[PDB]
Amino acid sequence: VHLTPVEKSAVTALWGKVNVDEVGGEALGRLLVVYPWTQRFFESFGDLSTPDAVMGNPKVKAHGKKVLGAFSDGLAHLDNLKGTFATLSELHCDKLHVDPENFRLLGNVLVCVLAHHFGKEFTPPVQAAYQKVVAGVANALAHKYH
Amino acid sequence: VHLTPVEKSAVTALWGKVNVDEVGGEALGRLLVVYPWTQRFFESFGDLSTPDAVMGNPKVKAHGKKVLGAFSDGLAHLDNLKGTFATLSELHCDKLHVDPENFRLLGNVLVCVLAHHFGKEFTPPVQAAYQKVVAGVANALAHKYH
Amino acid sequence: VLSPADKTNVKAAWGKVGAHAGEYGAEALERMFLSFPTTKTYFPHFDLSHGSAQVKGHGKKVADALTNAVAHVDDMPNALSALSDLHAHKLRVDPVNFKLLSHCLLVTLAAHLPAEFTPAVHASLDKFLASVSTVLTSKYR
Amino acid sequence: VLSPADKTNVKAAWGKVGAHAGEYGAEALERMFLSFPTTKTYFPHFDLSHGSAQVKGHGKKVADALTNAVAHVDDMPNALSALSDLHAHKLRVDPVNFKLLSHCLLVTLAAHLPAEFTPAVHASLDKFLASVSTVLTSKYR
Ligand code: HEM
Numbered sequence: 001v002h003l004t005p006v007e008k009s010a011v012t013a014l015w016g017k018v019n020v021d022e023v024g025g026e027a028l029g030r031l032l033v034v035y036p037w038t039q040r041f042f043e044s045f046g047d048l049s050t051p052d053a054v055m056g057n058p059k060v061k062a063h064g065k066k067v068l069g070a071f072s073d074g075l076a077h078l079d080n081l082k083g084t085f086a087t088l089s090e091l092h093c094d095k096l097h098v099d100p101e102n103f104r105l106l107g108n109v110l111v112c113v114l115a116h117h118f119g120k121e122f123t124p125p126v127q128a129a130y131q132k133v134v135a136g137v138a139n140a141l142a143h144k145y146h
Numbered sequence: 147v148h149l150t151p152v153e154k155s156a157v158t159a160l161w162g163k164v165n166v167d168e169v170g171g172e173a174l175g176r177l178l179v180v181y182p183w184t185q186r187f188f189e190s191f192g193d194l195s196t197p198d199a200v201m202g203n204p205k206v207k208a209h210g211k212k213v214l215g216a217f218s219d220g221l222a223h224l225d226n227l228k229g230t231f232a233t234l235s236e237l238h239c240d241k242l243h244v245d246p247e248n249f250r251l252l253g254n255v256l257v258c259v260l261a262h263h264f265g266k267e268f269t270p271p272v273q274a275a276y277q278k279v280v281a282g283v284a285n286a287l288a289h290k291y292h
Numbered sequence: 293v294l295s296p297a298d299k300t301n302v303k304a305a306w307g308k309v310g311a312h313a314g315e316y317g318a319e320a321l322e323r324m325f326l327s328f329p330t331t332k333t334y335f336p337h338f339d340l341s342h343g344s345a346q347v348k349g350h351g352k353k354v355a356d357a358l359t360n361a362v363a364h365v366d367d368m369p370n371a372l373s374a375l376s377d378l379h380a381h382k383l384r385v386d387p388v389n390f391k392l393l394s395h396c397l398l399v400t401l402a403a404h405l406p407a408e409f410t411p412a413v414h415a416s417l418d419k420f421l422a423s424v425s426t427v428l429t430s431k432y433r
Numbered sequence: 434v435l436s437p438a439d440k441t442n443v444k445a446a447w448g449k450v451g452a453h454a455g456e457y458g459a460e461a462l463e464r465m466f467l468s469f470p471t472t473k474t475y476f477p478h479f480d481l482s483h484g485s486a487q488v489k490g491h492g493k494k495v496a497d498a499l500t501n502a503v504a505h506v507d508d509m510p511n512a513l514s515a516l517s518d519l520h521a522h523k524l525r526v527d528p529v530n531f532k533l534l535s536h537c538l539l540v541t542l543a544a545h546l547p548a549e550f551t552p553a554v555h556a557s558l559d560k561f562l563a564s565v566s567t568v569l570t571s572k573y574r
């Protein structure tokens with residue numbers, strides 16, 4: 001878990017066409033609807049009783065946007081992600097209690113949004129860069145557990 | 147890998163005592179048998195049709211030591227296992243073709259043989275550090291696949 | 293279990309597949325290998341360059357597989373009966389890739405349906421490749 | 434798929450645990466929290482202090498439903514269906530964790546059943562172990 005500038009660049013350069021906000025209330029969005037026990041965390045939120053409910057909830061578009069803005073920024077510090085979210089991870093660990101296998105289930109429910117949103121440009125190979133980046137964030141998201 | 151002072155210490159002390167072509171033919175003896183599918187790498191090999199055909203197989207008996215004196219010499223470059231296990235990683239994958247969950251499979255295996263070779267001696271943070279330890283061990287011979 | 297909610301849902305994006313079928317199966321297998329590289333372990337004598345004629349029939353070959361499964365979704369385990377026997381004794385692929393080939397399908401799957409891919413839908417879908425993948429992992433041990 | 438032989442093997446080994454069971458259920462997990470700290474994410478309200486009273490009933494509770502699956506090997510969905518409805522529905526334990534804990538259990542019998550715990554017995558047991566996080570996974574749609 002080191003990325004390559006070839007790749008490393010697919011991430012951060014195709015990222016570019018990304019509108020954060022609708023990318024997050026959906027990724028954020030398909031998690032809670034595809035891995036139902038991530039619900040775990042938000043009965044705080046309202047009706048998460050249906051895809052529809054789910055997915056329509058502002059409280060959820062609300063947090064996802066917030067969850068992928070913080071994202072954006074870390075594609076900004078790729079060389080340094082552990083680097084970037086430590087603070088950001090103690091926090092989910094120490095405080096938030098999140099069962100960090102939720103980082104990989106979102107990286108991937110989000111490889112999937114990106115799937116759906118970009119179509120033919122989401123090539124195998126940007127797909128894949130896309131793939132170590134979600135995995136390492138996943139993993140820098142994770143380094144402060146104990 | 148990232149061991150501790152009283153970790154490596156504990157570490158270092160459980161193995162003076164590991165009996166190496168012993169625990170050895172033992173684990174790999176058991177992997178073969180717990181999850182019968184790693185069997186795929188070894189038909190040059192003879193009867194694995196059985197656990198006993200299996201614990202008595204010599205070719206296995208053999209190959210197994212190989213794998214732990216491989217292993218006992220790395221408990222020495224604890225400090226940089228990515229370093230000491232590079233040619234080997236370089237070969238599981240180029241020549242060999244073994245699927246890296248495997249190395250993850252036998253680490254768990256080697257903690258149950260200790261478990262059972264040692265008794266209350268193997269407590270939970272010594273368990274905990276050899277865990278930390280076969281963790282880096284497989285992390286380490288997968289390092290370079292590609 | 294997959295619910296009948298589940299069923300139609302599957303039968304239905306699968307219908308838009310129909311016949312590109314073979315091609316979602318190779319682009320499949322093709323991100324397979326560039327993203328999860330390790331899987332590659334399984335095909336030491338397969339030509340896996342972009343375009344391999346091998347990968348290609350692999351995929352009509354992987355796909356035809358799932359059409360079978362789908363057309364059979366209730367009879368799922370006698371369905372794939374025989375293949376079941378097949379990766380468990382013949383190739384004895386670790387189990388962990390299953391979960392790996394399932395996801396990237398999803399994604400071509402994914403990325404091929406602009407419209408077709410309700411998460412309503414998308415969940416139905418992760419969901420049938422896991423039984424689909426459970427069937428198959430069924431005679432391992 | 435529990436075989437028959439699988440089956441009297443789980444039964445003579447659970448057998449011998451006779452009574453340390455909720456003693457083995459607390460070491461189980463004592464283990465779980467120090468070899469894999471993630472799992473503790475799920476136990477934020479416990480005193481998970483070594484020898485903590487907290488984990489000592491859990492454990493106990495925690496080996497009872499196992500001894501009861503041991504006893505219904507033949508009907509477990511049922512057996513544990515009640516249990517199956519809590520895990521999936523209130524708890525929302527990541528099924529990923531099921532494997533750690535079963536990791537850990539194997540692993541306490543190892544050091545308490547010097548030779549009841551055959552290689553043919555760990556085999557037998559991993560799969561019991563196995564069979565057991567499925568059913569508890571199942572509720573999980
Ligand atoms: C990229 C993967 C994730 C990233 C980058 C991320 C990032 C963030 C950031 C920047 C915050 C703001 C917290 C703060 O400073 O106040 C946050 C909060 C939060 N996130 Fe994480 N998160 C991720 C995954 C998840 C998952 C998987 C869950 C549960 C599935 C989760 C649940 C939360 C919760 C519950 C909060 C606090 C909100 C409150 O009081 O409303 N996050 N996340």
Ligand code: HEM
Binds near residue numbers: 187234242244252283
């Ligand atoms: C961390 C776990 C493992 C270690 C440390 C390990 C270590 C070794 C070593 C040091 C060798 C010597 C190779 C040479 O350089 O000739 C070797 C050979 C080999 N291993 Fe790896 N091994 C591990 C797991 C496995 C596994 C799981 C398999 C298949 C399950 C495997 C299949 C083979 C084969 C075929 C050989 C060469 C043996 C022969 O040709 O007769 N190894 N292993």
Ligand code: HEM
Binds near residue numbers: 331335353375424
């Ligand atoms: C959705 C899960 C999967 C399904 C439905 C599936 C389906 C199939 C089907 C029909 C066949 C051909 C058997 C025959 O010749 O009659 C096949 C062959 C094969 N599969 Fe699976 N497969 C899956 C996952 C995997 C995975 C994850 C691997 C390894 C990562 C794998 C490795 C193979 C191999 C090596 C062959 C044989 C290749 C060659 O023979 O020349 N499959 N699969």
Ligand code: HEM
Binds near residue numbers: 475524530566
């Ligand atoms: C074989 C696997 C497991 C079995 C048989 C099992 C069994 C049980 C039983 C019988 C209860 C308590 C409630 C009741 O019936 O009155 C329980 C509670 C619980 N278990 Fe599971 N469990 C297993 C695996 C896990 C895992 C992997 C986790 C992860 C964190 C877990 C977490 C919890 C929590 C949080 C509770 C409630 C403790 C409390 O609620 O205070 N269990 N378990």
